[PDB]
Amino acid sequence: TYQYNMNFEKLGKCIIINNKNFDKVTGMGVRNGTDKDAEALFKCFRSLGFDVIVYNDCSCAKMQDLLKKASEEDHTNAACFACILLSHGEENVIYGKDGVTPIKDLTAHFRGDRCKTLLEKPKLFFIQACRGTELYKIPVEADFLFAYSTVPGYYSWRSPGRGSWFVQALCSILEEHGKDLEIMQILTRVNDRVARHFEKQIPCVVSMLTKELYFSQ
């Protein structure tokens, strides 16, 4: 009664947006290491049970349409939904290959009223991108969980040969405890593992979940 009901045919859809190469008119550089991240993320989430698909170098129109179409699909037999963003980022926005687009516009499509088949089900968003200085009734905003690579305003570090710190940590924890720990315990251990690397960066978790989340039983 205190856990989300996972007794469903599918665990859910998991979209992974992998933006590595950006157009020159944006001014952003190549993201070496993100390929190693996405692959690591693909294996982990597939092990959990997600039906995962990976889209490379997406534009702002693509990302928006990609998640709009996803909120229009039938999730009646799905236990939940998950999206992972791996791109460049500024104050409250995410980058495409042709510019910027708001994160809150990508998630809005999954609001309780905008996506009925996902009501009372968890919508997870994991974002790996930067942020800084730019030059019988139920709520519609409930059951969302965001896991940012960094707090609002600071940088997120990435290694060309090893990949990003947040992703490396996230996959390590999921590989071993993905089936026996609650979602907040996993993300809390990620916070710690990322913190213990410079001794700066520290992930942020925003939870509007109403029950505990486990990926099994």
Binding site: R31, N32, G33, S87, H88, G89, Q128, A129, C130, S149, Y155, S156, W157, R158, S159, P160, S164
Partner: peptide, 4 residues
């Protein structure tokens, strides 16, 4: 290490 590089920045995002």
């Amino acid at each position: 290490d590089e920045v995002x």
